[PDB]
Amino acid sequence: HHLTRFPRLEFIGAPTPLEYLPRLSDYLGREIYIKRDDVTPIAMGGNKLRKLEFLVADALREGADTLITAGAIQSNHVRQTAAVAAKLGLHCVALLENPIGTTAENYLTNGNRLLLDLFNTQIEMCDALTDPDAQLQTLATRIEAQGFRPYVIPVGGSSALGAMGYVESALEIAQQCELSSVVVASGSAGTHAGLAVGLEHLMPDVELIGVTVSRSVAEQKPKVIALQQAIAGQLALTATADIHLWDDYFAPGYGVPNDAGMEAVKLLASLEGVLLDPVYTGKAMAGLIDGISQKRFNDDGPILFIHTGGAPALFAYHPHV
Amino acid sequence: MPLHHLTRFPRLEFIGAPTPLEYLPRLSDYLGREIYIKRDDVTPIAMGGNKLRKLEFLVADALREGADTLITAGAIQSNHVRQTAAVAAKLGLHCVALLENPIGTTAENYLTNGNRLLLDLFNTQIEMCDALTDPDAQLQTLATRIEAQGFRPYVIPVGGSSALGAMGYVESALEIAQQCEEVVGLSSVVVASGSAGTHAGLAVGLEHLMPDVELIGVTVSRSVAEQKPKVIALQQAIAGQLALTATADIHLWDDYFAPGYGVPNDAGMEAVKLLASLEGVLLDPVYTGKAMAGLIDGISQKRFNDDGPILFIHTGGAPALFAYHPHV
């Protein structure tokens, strides 16, 4: 209810499709549905756009002329922020790292990174995002002292404000489903947490599972919980639901493809004409599939996979590294 | 009323809702004229595009006749082939693609990245040829060999551009008319003109719904002399199928595609950079970049019949950006 008290820009408009996947369902022997948050009208789309609706509205209210964020070279978030900035006539400054130590030309210059150049993003390279919030604040102070009005967007757009975007997706989900499980990639945690708050109130019987793409359960759980509480607090709701996380599917680490993940990509492509990605959704789908094999879900009814986007990264990861 | 026979053709649901029609305030401010964009690049299937509109009718036709295989042709970086392959996968139809290298490039990203990468993901059977000198005959030869294996092939022509395929853009015109209604009085529409189905579909639709609007195709592969009869033939065939006449003159501009099909040019790349930096919109080096360069220059030279609002049809093509980088 209090969701409408938050300023937001319209970047998406109509609710994204929720689709049945008959061929994948037939193959896995389980009813699988997909939330197509990969289909959004801005610069090849994705989940970060839902967050930016709130974050950029806040930016404009604060009178910013510059958006500053951070991510890997192949960040979907940075690409979406850069496109949104260009659309609104805002400057954009991206703080980037190479998280996998690659020198592969396509990772360094193609995919999302190519798009950043098209969007006229000012690029700042750092050796590592060891303390992103801190490093972004340092950068913002320079730019502010330089004569600009920056607005800092945290890594993956995952603040309590940004995460409102995924409380919003939860409303679409609830509307469109009128299910036993929901599966989503859990990275910077805004998507997971927002969905957790929304689904708790809208679909309490449904098990929400985050498949981690960068961290162990131990490392990831406190982050998702912290966001869950902050979101609930700002909406004047209670959030008591357990956070469920599966960390078996991201090795050897963030932004490195693995076989299970790339095989998930091939499966969805060949069976459904759907495009996943090597960093996020492929790994999450690999988790979904294994959850079936291992009978890992609370019960064995329909599963909703949340497609958070990421496909432009296919072109940066080809042919390897 | 006049486009009612369109109801008769069976068609599949690939798009769902009408695609967004958006004002471009920053581009409009720069160009000194009201620019709107029809977002046909924003469709739900495998990175979208205009070809998906045609496939709705072509594939419905294939299913009706009991086909289990789709066969079509294009460049290695064809958007059509990629969209055909994606649809085939989704429907559990087999897909065979006859590909050529139209520009003689050895650049690895052209050969293996972009649309061509996606083809492998959709399990497309790839069939290379030196050139598409006679695509109708080459597709038919391939269909004979495919049929010998026991498949039931349905041949989709280059770009999905038959009268039936073009019905998708008659439908697009209906959307456009409804979307502009009481919101904007369009003076002009710009679309890239390639295999001609999109242009022809729009020509018939717009003649009957928005008769005063000037439709302009920017050629991406041929001169006016070569392209114009192709568009007209389709236009007349589309009108016939709908029990309508189509008396409108087809308008084409061929100044914006040199040195040739699939070869990027400066004006095209500047248009791509302009749309990206001003509107966060991604065009492509083969089709939309060149069409936009046409629009821009059309404003500059006052080539349009009337200087009112222009609607640019975004036909898609963005995955090729990754194939054309860093060069071909």
Residue numbers in the entry:
A (entry chain B): 4 to 181, 186 to 328
B (entry chain A): 1 to 328
What is written in the article reporting this PDB entry?
The crystals of StDCyD obtained in the presence of D-Cys and βCDA show the product pyruvate at a site ∼5 Å away from the substrate binding pocket. The additional electron density observed in the complex is consistent with two different binding sites for the substrate. The electron density observed at the active site pocket was not adequate to model the ligand used for soaking the crystals. The density could be modeled as a sulphate and two water molecules. The density at the other site 4.0–6.0 Å away from the active site could be modeled either as product of the catalytic reaction, pyruvate or final intermediate of the reaction, aminoacrylate. Examination of the residual electron density after refinement with various occupancies for pyruvate and the aminoacrylate suggested that it is more likely to represent a pyruvate.
D-cysteine (D-Cys) moieties are found in firefly luciferin, semisynthetic cephalosporin MT141 and malformin A. D-cysteine desulfhydrase (DCyD) is suggested to take part in the catabolic degradation of D-Cys and D-Cys-containing toxic compounds.
